[PDB]
């Protein structure tokens, strides 16, 4: 895609903190940028759209290379069009704004580069307010193995780059991404909704889901891919699980793991109020070159340090962190193939972490599975009493996009106090 000039692109500021054991925490002047899928795309020499609703203009876009040459991504009115605001330390992402549904933004080091976080033998910490984030919605904070420049160095047809939010990829190898590898994804374009479609290519990469949640359920999930970095796929390589990527991931959702009273409204972690979420990425030898061996989770709310809940599933050791062994155990228990281990398990997740990953923050609804996988029974054809089926208490009928968008359009999530650095250094304790 080209870089448009009709609307100035001004990235909201979202300060973060980098922390070290000896030095404490220091501010970084990071920013956020809207993902390229949500943007206006128009002819480079004017105002005519290249994409409207759920279709491309085939005159401007007869093939992916010609489309990318002819079409430009432009600047965004963050609050007015997308319902995205920042105080400079707290990011509010509103659900419906006019005809726009949801958003995804990336954390930037500067106006042309995503922040590349290297979190081996490090931790990541943030505050979240899900008070107004219900069943069917997902306020997600996560890592993708994207390039810091959004792909510009690799793909001559991408002249827009990180400044315009290009180069997404994730463990689901999505085929709804409009620009991949510098080409518009227009081949065999198929409508999937009023504003969305899919093309013949998907875009794959390893993903660490630090946080997928609403006030009914939360999950943290590594998803390794056998490939390294952002990879365009065709055919069954795009196929979830069986292709390049573990689409399912090794998840730790307290409720799915057999503890139905840890996290939710009025629970130990009270989702009706803000709280702090710490995620630590331990290596087997406590070094940054070591092998990712454990992902630990600690919560803080009202100054109380809250350790993660323990698993309570027959056949699964009663642990409260993600490990290779916990993954093998919960996949057998749940009847899920260990696509995670097949792709290289925590070791492979860890090398993606070591190579550097981009932070995404988002609010969305789920046209495919209605968020049931997060907060209800899934699959919708399995017995809810079976281990792993039930992931929350949302109704099996909730989360249909058309219902949530009219009933709770002013839902939002707030992400704030973003910190990363040495293990134990982004937060403190005392007696
Ligand atoms: C790594 O740190 C852990 C604390 O989480 C500690 O228990 C262990 O002794 C350390 N291991 C090595 C080999 O230094």
PDB file of N, CA and C in Angstrom, residues 328-423:
ATOM      1  N   UNK A 328       0.930 -30.423  27.763  1.00  0.00           N
ATOM      2  CA  UNK A 328       0.725 -31.818  27.333  1.00  0.00           C
ATOM      3  C   UNK A 328      -0.417 -32.360  28.131  1.00  0.00           C
ATOM      4  N   UNK A 329      -0.408 -32.120  29.435  1.00  0.00           N
ATOM      5  CA  UNK A 329      -1.444 -32.604  30.281  1.00  0.00           C
ATOM      6  C   UNK A 329      -2.790 -32.059  30.043  1.00  0.00           C
ATOM      7  N   UNK A 330      -2.950 -30.732  29.916  1.00  0.00           N
ATOM      8  CA  UNK A 330      -4.295 -30.220  29.650  1.00  0.00           C
ATOM      9  C   UNK A 330      -4.840 -30.593  28.209  1.00  0.00           C
ATOM     10  N   UNK A 331      -3.940 -30.781  27.215  1.00  0.00           N
ATOM     11  CA  UNK A 331      -4.376 -31.124  25.841  1.00  0.00           C
ATOM     12  C   UNK A 331      -4.927 -32.603  25.880  1.00  0.00           C
ATOM     13  N   UNK A 332      -4.262 -33.477  26.627  1.00  0.00           N
ATOM     14  CA  UNK A 332      -4.717 -34.861  26.733  1.00  0.00           C
ATOM     15  C   UNK A 332      -6.021 -34.861  27.488  1.00  0.00           C
ATOM     16  N   UNK A 333      -6.075 -34.109  28.570  1.00  0.00           N
ATOM     17  CA  UNK A 333      -7.290 -34.042  29.347  1.00  0.00           C
ATOM     18  C   UNK A 333      -8.451 -33.555  28.640  1.00  0.00           C
ATOM     19  N   UNK A 334      -8.201 -32.549  27.817  1.00  0.00           N
ATOM     20  CA  UNK A 334      -9.277 -31.947  27.052  1.00  0.00           C
ATOM     21  C   UNK A 334      -9.613 -32.573  25.699  1.00  0.00           C
ATOM     22  N   UNK A 335      -8.818 -33.559  25.296  1.00  0.00           N
ATOM     23  CA  UNK A 335      -9.025 -34.194  24.004  1.00  0.00           C
ATOM     24  C   UNK A 335      -8.549 -33.362  22.858  1.00  0.00           C
ATOM     25  N   UNK A 336      -7.603 -32.445  23.066  1.00  0.00           N
ATOM     26  CA  UNK A 336      -7.148 -31.605  22.019  1.00  0.00           C
ATOM     27  C   UNK A 336      -5.778 -32.095  21.657  1.00  0.00           C
ATOM     28  N   UNK A 337      -5.502 -32.100  20.373  1.00  0.00           N
ATOM     29  CA  UNK A 337      -4.198 -32.520  19.855  1.00  0.00           C
ATOM     30  C   UNK A 337      -3.224 -31.405  20.313  1.00  0.00           C
ATOM     31  N   UNK A 338      -2.001 -31.823  20.571  1.00  0.00           N
ATOM     32  CA  UNK A 338      -1.016 -30.874  21.058  1.00  0.00           C
ATOM     33  C   UNK A 338      -0.274 -30.317  19.919  1.00  0.00           C
ATOM     34  N   UNK A 339      -0.975 -29.425  19.175  1.00  0.00           N
ATOM     35  CA  UNK A 339      -0.477 -28.703  18.020  1.00  0.00           C
ATOM     36  C   UNK A 339       0.598 -27.760  18.531  1.00  0.00           C
ATOM     37  N   UNK A 340       0.432 -27.282  19.765  1.00  0.00           N
ATOM     38  CA  UNK A 340       1.448 -26.500  20.447  1.00  0.00           C
ATOM     39  C   UNK A 340       2.825 -27.077  20.493  1.00  0.00           C
ATOM     40  N   UNK A 341       2.924 -28.368  20.959  1.00  0.00           N
ATOM     41  CA  UNK A 341       4.185 -29.123  21.009  1.00  0.00           C
ATOM     42  C   UNK A 341       4.668 -29.422  19.589  1.00  0.00           C
ATOM     43  N   UNK A 342       3.758 -29.693  18.676  1.00  0.00           N
ATOM     44  CA  UNK A 342       4.063 -29.990  17.271  1.00  0.00           C
ATOM     45  C   UNK A 342       4.791 -28.858  16.585  1.00  0.00           C
ATOM     46  N   UNK A 343       4.398 -27.617  16.946  1.00  0.00           N
ATOM     47  CA  UNK A 343       5.048 -26.428  16.449  1.00  0.00           C
ATOM     48  C   UNK A 343       6.322 -26.010  17.209  1.00  0.00           C
ATOM     49  N   UNK A 344       6.619 -26.711  18.308  1.00  0.00           N
ATOM     50  CA  UNK A 344       7.840 -26.471  19.026  1.00  0.00           C
ATOM     51  C   UNK A 344       7.681 -26.056  20.510  1.00  0.00           C
ATOM     52  N   UNK A 345       6.438 -26.063  20.956  1.00  0.00           N
ATOM     53  CA  UNK A 345       6.054 -25.708  22.321  1.00  0.00           C
ATOM     54  C   UNK A 345       6.602 -24.383  22.826  1.00  0.00           C
ATOM     55  N   UNK A 346       6.913 -24.407  24.104  1.00  0.00           N
ATOM     56  CA  UNK A 346       7.376 -23.161  24.751  1.00  0.00           C
ATOM     57  C   UNK A 346       8.696 -22.746  24.210  1.00  0.00           C
ATOM     58  N   UNK A 347       9.529 -23.716  23.786  1.00  0.00           N
ATOM     59  CA  UNK A 347      10.818 -23.369  23.244  1.00  0.00           C
ATOM     60  C   UNK A 347      10.628 -22.445  22.017  1.00  0.00           C
ATOM     61  N   UNK A 348       9.762 -22.882  21.106  1.00  0.00           N
ATOM     62  CA  UNK A 348       9.464 -22.168  19.870  1.00  0.00           C
ATOM     63  C   UNK A 348       8.756 -20.817  20.167  1.00  0.00           C
ATOM     64  N   UNK A 349       7.849 -20.836  21.131  1.00  0.00           N
ATOM     65  CA  UNK A 349       7.225 -19.552  21.583  1.00  0.00           C
ATOM     66  C   UNK A 349       8.324 -18.653  22.077  1.00  0.00           C
ATOM     67  N   UNK A 350       9.212 -19.201  22.882  1.00  0.00           N
ATOM     68  CA  UNK A 350      10.262 -18.417  23.480  1.00  0.00           C
ATOM     69  C   UNK A 350      11.208 -17.823  22.464  1.00  0.00           C
ATOM     70  N   UNK A 351      11.573 -18.551  21.392  1.00  0.00           N
ATOM     71  CA  UNK A 351      12.449 -17.937  20.409  1.00  0.00           C
ATOM     72  C   UNK A 351      11.743 -16.781  19.707  1.00  0.00           C
ATOM     73  N   UNK A 352      10.421 -16.895  19.501  1.00  0.00           N
ATOM     74  CA  UNK A 352       9.664 -15.742  18.972  1.00  0.00           C
ATOM     75  C   UNK A 352       9.720 -14.561  19.948  1.00  0.00           C
ATOM     76  N   UNK A 353       9.565 -14.853  21.225  1.00  0.00           N
ATOM     77  CA  UNK A 353       9.743 -13.789  22.200  1.00  0.00           C
ATOM     78  C   UNK A 353      11.153 -13.201  22.146  1.00  0.00           C
ATOM     79  N   UNK A 354      12.142 -14.076  22.016  1.00  0.00           N
ATOM     80  CA  UNK A 354      13.539 -13.611  21.954  1.00  0.00           C
ATOM     81  C   UNK A 354      13.877 -12.769  20.758  1.00  0.00           C
ATOM     82  N   UNK A 355      13.254 -13.051  19.629  1.00  0.00           N
ATOM     83  CA  UNK A 355      13.488 -12.306  18.423  1.00  0.00           C
ATOM     84  C   UNK A 355      12.819 -10.907  18.427  1.00  0.00           C
ATOM     85  N   UNK A 356      11.854 -10.742  19.323  1.00  0.00           N
ATOM     86  CA  UNK A 356      11.146  -9.471  19.402  1.00  0.00           C
ATOM     87  C   UNK A 356       9.756  -9.577  18.844  1.00  0.00           C
ATOM     88  N   UNK A 357       8.842  -8.973  19.574  1.00  0.00           N
ATOM     89  CA  UNK A 357       7.408  -8.998  19.216  1.00  0.00           C
ATOM     90  C   UNK A 357       6.751  -7.649  19.417  1.00  0.00           C
ATOM     91  N   UNK A 358       5.662  -7.444  18.666  1.00  0.00           N
ATOM     92  CA  UNK A 358       4.920  -6.189  18.661  1.00  0.00           C
ATOM     93  C   UNK A 358       3.671  -6.322  19.532  1.00  0.00           C
ATOM     94  N   UNK A 359       3.422  -5.298  20.362  1.00  0.00           N
ATOM     95  CA  UNK A 359       2.271  -5.271  21.261  1.00  0.00           C
ATOM     96  C   UNK A 359       1.037  -4.719  20.534  1.00  0.00           C
ATOM     97  N   UNK A 360      -0.036  -5.501  20.520  1.00  0.00           N
ATOM     98  CA  UNK A 360      -1.325  -5.111  19.998  1.00  0.00           C
ATOM     99  C   UNK A 360      -2.331  -4.981  21.159  1.00  0.00           C
ATOM    100  N   UNK A 361      -3.203  -3.981  21.033  1.00  0.00           N
ATOM    101  CA  UNK A 361      -4.278  -3.760  21.975  1.00  0.00           C
ATOM    102  C   UNK A 361      -5.518  -3.628  21.157  1.00  0.00           C
ATOM    103  N   UNK A 362      -6.627  -4.250  21.579  1.00  0.00           N
ATOM    104  CA  UNK A 362      -7.830  -4.314  20.737  1.00  0.00           C
ATOM    105  C   UNK A 362      -9.103  -4.502  21.527  1.00  0.00           C
ATOM    106  N   UNK A 363     -10.198  -4.091  20.882  1.00  0.00           N
ATOM    107  CA  UNK A 363     -11.547  -4.442  21.360  1.00  0.00           C
ATOM    108  C   UNK A 363     -12.233  -4.990  20.143  1.00  0.00           C
ATOM    109  N   UNK A 364     -12.904  -6.152  20.285  1.00  0.00           N
ATOM    110  CA  UNK A 364     -13.549  -6.784  19.172  1.00  0.00           C
ATOM    111  C   UNK A 364     -14.693  -7.717  19.592  1.00  0.00           C
ATOM    112  N   UNK A 365     -15.524  -8.048  18.597  1.00  0.00           N
ATOM    113  CA  UNK A 365     -16.504  -9.177  18.685  1.00  0.00           C
ATOM    114  C   UNK A 365     -16.139 -10.231  17.617  1.00  0.00           C
ATOM    115  N   UNK A 366     -16.752 -11.435  17.684  1.00  0.00           N
ATOM    116  CA  UNK A 366     -16.306 -12.612  16.980  1.00  0.00           C
ATOM    117  C   UNK A 366     -17.419 -13.129  16.096  1.00  0.00           C
ATOM    118  N   UNK A 367     -17.292 -12.864  14.801  1.00  0.00           N
ATOM    119  CA  UNK A 367     -18.269 -13.319  13.819  1.00  0.00           C
ATOM    120  C   UNK A 367     -18.154 -14.830  13.648  1.00  0.00           C
ATOM    121  N   UNK A 368     -17.000 -15.432  13.903  1.00  0.00           N
ATOM    122  CA  UNK A 368     -16.851 -16.864  13.675  1.00  0.00           C
ATOM    123  C   UNK A 368     -17.434 -17.748  14.793  1.00  0.00           C
ATOM    124  N   UNK A 369     -16.955 -17.556  16.000  1.00  0.00           N
ATOM    125  CA  UNK A 369     -17.372 -18.387  17.126  1.00  0.00           C
ATOM    126  C   UNK A 369     -18.125 -17.648  18.246  1.00  0.00           C
ATOM    127  N   UNK A 370     -18.499 -16.398  18.043  1.00  0.00           N
ATOM    128  CA  UNK A 370     -19.256 -15.617  19.021  1.00  0.00           C
ATOM    129  C   UNK A 370     -18.622 -15.425  20.439  1.00  0.00           C
ATOM    130  N   UNK A 371     -17.309 -15.624  20.492  1.00  0.00           N
ATOM    131  CA  UNK A 371     -16.490 -15.484  21.705  1.00  0.00           C
ATOM    132  C   UNK A 371     -16.748 -16.650  22.668  1.00  0.00           C
ATOM    133  N   UNK A 372     -17.512 -17.643  22.198  1.00  0.00           N
ATOM    134  CA  UNK A 372     -17.867 -18.749  23.091  1.00  0.00           C
ATOM    135  C   UNK A 372     -16.619 -19.476  23.629  1.00  0.00           C
ATOM    136  N   UNK A 373     -15.589 -19.506  22.811  1.00  0.00           N
ATOM    137  CA  UNK A 373     -14.336 -20.168  23.142  1.00  0.00           C
ATOM    138  C   UNK A 373     -13.680 -19.507  24.380  1.00  0.00           C
ATOM    139  N   UNK A 374     -14.106 -18.278  24.678  1.00  0.00           N
ATOM    140  CA  UNK A 374     -13.504 -17.495  25.750  1.00  0.00           C
ATOM    141  C   UNK A 374     -14.405 -17.554  26.968  1.00  0.00           C
ATOM    142  N   UNK A 375     -15.698 -17.454  26.723  1.00  0.00           N
ATOM    143  CA  UNK A 375     -16.513 -17.268  27.859  1.00  0.00           C
ATOM    144  C   UNK A 375     -17.764 -18.209  27.944  1.00  0.00           C
ATOM    145  N   UNK A 376     -17.756 -19.334  27.280  1.00  0.00           N
ATOM    146  CA  UNK A 376     -18.930 -20.198  27.244  1.00  0.00           C
ATOM    147  C   UNK A 376     -18.478 -21.629  26.882  1.00  0.00           C
ATOM    148  N   UNK A 377     -19.410 -22.409  26.289  1.00  0.00           N
ATOM    149  CA  UNK A 377     -19.068 -23.734  25.904  1.00  0.00           C
ATOM    150  C   UNK A 377     -18.558 -23.817  24.518  1.00  0.00           C
ATOM    151  N   UNK A 378     -17.461 -24.538  24.284  1.00  0.00           N
ATOM    152  CA  UNK A 378     -16.993 -24.719  22.999  1.00  0.00           C
ATOM    153  C   UNK A 378     -16.218 -26.013  22.977  1.00  0.00           C
ATOM    154  N   UNK A 379     -16.321 -26.779  21.904  1.00  0.00           N
ATOM    155  CA  UNK A 379     -17.311 -26.511  20.821  1.00  0.00           C
ATOM    156  C   UNK A 379     -18.844 -26.519  21.306  1.00  0.00           C
ATOM    157  N   UNK A 380     -19.792 -25.953  20.513  1.00  0.00           N
ATOM    158  CA  UNK A 380     -21.213 -25.801  20.922  1.00  0.00           C
ATOM    159  C   UNK A 380     -21.931 -27.138  20.760  1.00  0.00           C
ATOM    160  N   UNK A 381     -21.190 -28.108  20.279  1.00  0.00           N
ATOM    161  CA  UNK A 381     -21.714 -29.464  20.114  1.00  0.00           C
ATOM    162  C   UNK A 381     -21.112 -30.466  21.084  1.00  0.00           C
ATOM    163  N   UNK A 382     -20.301 -30.020  22.025  1.00  0.00           N
ATOM    164  CA  UNK A 382     -19.744 -30.948  23.003  1.00  0.00           C
ATOM    165  C   UNK A 382     -20.483 -30.782  24.322  1.00  0.00           C
ATOM    166  N   UNK A 383     -20.396 -31.836  25.129  1.00  0.00           N
ATOM    167  CA  UNK A 383     -21.034 -31.809  26.391  1.00  0.00           C
ATOM    168  C   UNK A 383     -20.281 -30.907  27.361  1.00  0.00           C
ATOM    169  N   UNK A 384     -20.997 -29.948  27.858  1.00  0.00           N
ATOM    170  CA  UNK A 384     -20.504 -28.965  28.776  1.00  0.00           C
ATOM    171  C   UNK A 384     -19.963 -29.511  30.030  1.00  0.00           C
ATOM    172  N   UNK A 385     -20.178 -30.784  30.340  1.00  0.00           N
ATOM    173  CA  UNK A 385     -19.734 -31.299  31.607  1.00  0.00           C
ATOM    174  C   UNK A 385     -18.396 -31.930  31.364  1.00  0.00           C
ATOM    175  N   UNK A 386     -18.016 -32.088  30.087  1.00  0.00           N
ATOM    176  CA  UNK A 386     -16.712 -32.668  29.783  1.00  0.00           C
ATOM    177  C   UNK A 386     -15.531 -31.672  30.062  1.00  0.00           C
ATOM    178  N   UNK A 387     -14.400 -32.185  30.529  1.00  0.00           N
ATOM    179  CA  UNK A 387     -13.277 -31.313  30.816  1.00  0.00           C
ATOM    180  C   UNK A 387     -12.937 -30.521  29.613  1.00  0.00           C
ATOM    181  N   UNK A 388     -12.721 -29.234  29.852  1.00  0.00           N
ATOM    182  CA  UNK A 388     -12.310 -28.305  28.816  1.00  0.00           C
ATOM    183  C   UNK A 388     -13.410 -27.679  28.002  1.00  0.00           C
ATOM    184  N   UNK A 389     -14.643 -28.198  28.064  1.00  0.00           N
ATOM    185  CA  UNK A 389     -15.715 -27.633  27.221  1.00  0.00           C
ATOM    186  C   UNK A 389     -16.211 -26.285  27.661  1.00  0.00           C
ATOM    187  N   UNK A 390     -16.444 -26.222  28.930  1.00  0.00           N
ATOM    188  CA  UNK A 390     -16.954 -25.014  29.547  1.00  0.00           C
ATOM    189  C   UNK A 390     -15.766 -23.999  29.913  1.00  0.00           C
ATOM    190  N   UNK A 391     -15.780 -22.761  29.374  1.00  0.00           N
ATOM    191  CA  UNK A 391     -14.692 -21.784  29.596  1.00  0.00           C
ATOM    192  C   UNK A 391     -15.223 -20.547  30.373  1.00  0.00           C
ATOM    193  N   UNK A 392     -16.526 -20.390  30.484  1.00  0.00           N
ATOM    194  CA  UNK A 392     -17.079 -19.353  31.299  1.00  0.00           C
ATOM    195  C   UNK A 392     -18.553 -19.597  31.454  1.00  0.00           C
ATOM    196  N   UNK A 393     -19.236 -18.598  32.032  1.00  0.00           N
ATOM    197  CA  UNK A 393     -20.716 -18.685  32.262  1.00  0.00           C
ATOM    198  C   UNK A 393     -21.569 -17.853  31.332  1.00  0.00           C
ATOM    199  N   UNK A 394     -20.990 -17.324  30.236  1.00  0.00           N
ATOM    200  CA  UNK A 394     -21.783 -16.639  29.239  1.00  0.00           C
ATOM    201  C   UNK A 394     -22.735 -17.667  28.554  1.00  0.00           C
ATOM    202  N   UNK A 395     -23.941 -17.224  28.210  1.00  0.00           N
ATOM    203  CA  UNK A 395     -24.930 -18.064  27.518  1.00  0.00           C
ATOM    204  C   UNK A 395     -24.409 -18.543  26.165  1.00  0.00           C
ATOM    205  N   UNK A 396     -24.820 -19.727  25.763  1.00  0.00           N
ATOM    206  CA  UNK A 396     -24.360 -20.224  24.486  1.00  0.00           C
ATOM    207  C   UNK A 396     -24.917 -19.394  23.348  1.00  0.00           C
ATOM    208  N   UNK A 397     -25.832 -18.522  23.656  1.00  0.00           N
ATOM    209  CA  UNK A 397     -26.499 -17.669  22.671  1.00  0.00           C
ATOM    210  C   UNK A 397     -25.871 -16.299  22.596  1.00  0.00           C
ATOM    211  N   UNK A 398     -24.961 -15.972  23.516  1.00  0.00           N
ATOM    212  CA  UNK A 398     -24.376 -14.619  23.506  1.00  0.00           C
ATOM    213  C   UNK A 398     -23.302 -14.491  22.455  1.00  0.00           C
ATOM    214  N   UNK A 399     -22.878 -13.252  22.285  1.00  0.00           N
ATOM    215  CA  UNK A 399     -21.728 -12.917  21.443  1.00  0.00           C
ATOM    216  C   UNK A 399     -21.966 -12.826  19.958  1.00  0.00           C
ATOM    217  N   UNK A 400     -23.204 -12.980  19.508  1.00  0.00           N
ATOM    218  CA  UNK A 400     -23.469 -12.815  18.092  1.00  0.00           C
ATOM    219  C   UNK A 400     -23.239 -11.329  17.777  1.00  0.00           C
ATOM    220  N   UNK A 401     -22.354 -11.043  16.847  1.00  0.00           N
ATOM    221  CA  UNK A 401     -22.012  -9.634  16.537  1.00  0.00           C
ATOM    222  C   UNK A 401     -23.202  -8.711  16.398  1.00  0.00           C
ATOM    223  N   UNK A 402     -24.202  -9.119  15.607  1.00  0.00           N
ATOM    224  CA  UNK A 402     -25.331  -8.257  15.384  1.00  0.00           C
ATOM    225  C   UNK A 402     -26.050  -7.928  16.688  1.00  0.00           C
ATOM    226  N   UNK A 403     -26.101  -8.852  17.646  1.00  0.00           N
ATOM    227  CA  UNK A 403     -26.756  -8.511  18.914  1.00  0.00           C
ATOM    228  C   UNK A 403     -25.892  -7.592  19.776  1.00  0.00           C
ATOM    229  N   UNK A 404     -24.623  -7.928  19.988  1.00  0.00           N
ATOM    230  CA  UNK A 404     -23.802  -7.060  20.849  1.00  0.00           C
ATOM    231  C   UNK A 404     -23.658  -5.607  20.356  1.00  0.00           C
ATOM    232  N   UNK A 405     -23.502  -5.443  19.043  1.00  0.00           N
ATOM    233  CA  UNK A 405     -23.317  -4.093  18.447  1.00  0.00           C
ATOM    234  C   UNK A 405     -24.542  -3.159  18.667  1.00  0.00           C
ATOM    235  N   UNK A 406     -25.743  -3.713  18.748  1.00  0.00           N
ATOM    236  CA  UNK A 406     -26.886  -2.813  19.036  1.00  0.00           C
ATOM    237  C   UNK A 406     -27.234  -2.678  20.521  1.00  0.00           C
ATOM    238  N   UNK A 407     -26.976  -3.742  21.280  1.00  0.00           N
ATOM    239  CA  UNK A 407     -27.296  -3.750  22.704  1.00  0.00           C
ATOM    240  C   UNK A 407     -26.303  -3.061  23.636  1.00  0.00           C
ATOM    241  N   UNK A 408     -24.998  -3.238  23.384  1.00  0.00           N
ATOM    242  CA  UNK A 408     -23.984  -2.635  24.253  1.00  0.00           C
ATOM    243  C   UNK A 408     -22.927  -1.903  23.439  1.00  0.00           C
ATOM    244  N   UNK A 409     -23.293  -0.922  22.620  1.00  0.00           N
ATOM    245  CA  UNK A 409     -22.319  -0.277  21.722  1.00  0.00           C
ATOM    246  C   UNK A 409     -21.285   0.586  22.457  1.00  0.00           C
ATOM    247  N   UNK A 410     -21.586   1.102  23.624  1.00  0.00           N
ATOM    248  CA  UNK A 410     -20.717   1.982  24.394  1.00  0.00           C
ATOM    249  C   UNK A 410     -19.839   1.183  25.380  1.00  0.00           C
ATOM    250  N   UNK A 411     -19.802  -0.131  25.230  1.00  0.00           N
ATOM    251  CA  UNK A 411     -18.796  -0.933  25.938  1.00  0.00           C
ATOM    252  C   UNK A 411     -17.406  -0.405  25.583  1.00  0.00           C
ATOM    253  N   UNK A 412     -16.476  -0.573  26.508  1.00  0.00           N
ATOM    254  CA  UNK A 412     -15.077  -0.120  26.301  1.00  0.00           C
ATOM    255  C   UNK A 412     -14.189  -0.931  27.200  1.00  0.00           C
ATOM    256  N   UNK A 413     -12.900  -0.859  26.886  1.00  0.00           N
ATOM    257  CA  UNK A 413     -11.852  -1.350  27.761  1.00  0.00           C
ATOM    258  C   UNK A 413     -10.848  -0.256  27.939  1.00  0.00           C
ATOM    259  N   UNK A 414     -10.278  -0.180  29.125  1.00  0.00           N
ATOM    260  CA  UNK A 414      -9.185   0.751  29.389  1.00  0.00           C
ATOM    261  C   UNK A 414      -7.927   0.004  29.805  1.00  0.00           C
ATOM    262  N   UNK A 415      -6.853   0.227  29.072  1.00  0.00           N
ATOM    263  CA  UNK A 415      -5.524  -0.371  29.351  1.00  0.00           C
ATOM    264  C   UNK A 415      -4.585   0.754  29.786  1.00  0.00           C
ATOM    265  N   UNK A 416      -3.898   0.604  30.906  1.00  0.00           N
ATOM    266  CA  UNK A 416      -3.070   1.678  31.422  1.00  0.00           C
ATOM    267  C   UNK A 416      -1.877   1.089  32.151  1.00  0.00           C
ATOM    268  N   UNK A 417      -1.015   1.975  32.663  1.00  0.00           N
ATOM    269  CA  UNK A 417       0.168   1.618  33.415  1.00  0.00           C
ATOM    270  C   UNK A 417       0.960   0.441  32.801  1.00  0.00           C
ATOM    271  N   UNK A 418       1.328   0.616  31.548  1.00  0.00           N
ATOM    272  CA  UNK A 418       2.041  -0.407  30.847  1.00  0.00           C
ATOM    273  C   UNK A 418       3.501  -0.398  31.266  1.00  0.00           C
ATOM    274  N   UNK A 419       4.024  -1.548  31.679  1.00  0.00           N
ATOM    275  CA  UNK A 419       5.440  -1.653  32.151  1.00  0.00           C
ATOM    276  C   UNK A 419       6.062  -2.944  31.699  1.00  0.00           C
ATOM    277  N   UNK A 420       7.370  -2.975  31.455  1.00  0.00           N
ATOM    278  CA  UNK A 420       8.034  -4.205  31.126  1.00  0.00           C
ATOM    279  C   UNK A 420       9.474  -4.127  31.617  1.00  0.00           C
ATOM    280  N   UNK A 421      10.048  -5.278  31.856  1.00  0.00           N
ATOM    281  CA  UNK A 421      11.464  -5.286  32.255  1.00  0.00           C
ATOM    282  C   UNK A 421      11.812  -6.487  33.078  1.00  0.00           C
ATOM    283  N   UNK A 422      12.843  -6.386  33.929  1.00  0.00           N
ATOM    284  CA  UNK A 422      13.317  -7.508  34.678  1.00  0.00           C
ATOM    285  C   UNK A 422      12.216  -8.151  35.510  1.00  0.00           C
ATOM    286  N   UNK A 423      12.342  -9.440  35.669  1.00  0.00           N
ATOM    287  CA  UNK A 423      11.366 -10.172  36.495  1.00  0.00           C
ATOM    288  C   UNK A 423      11.413  -9.671  37.927  1.00  0.00           C
TER     289      UNK A 423
END
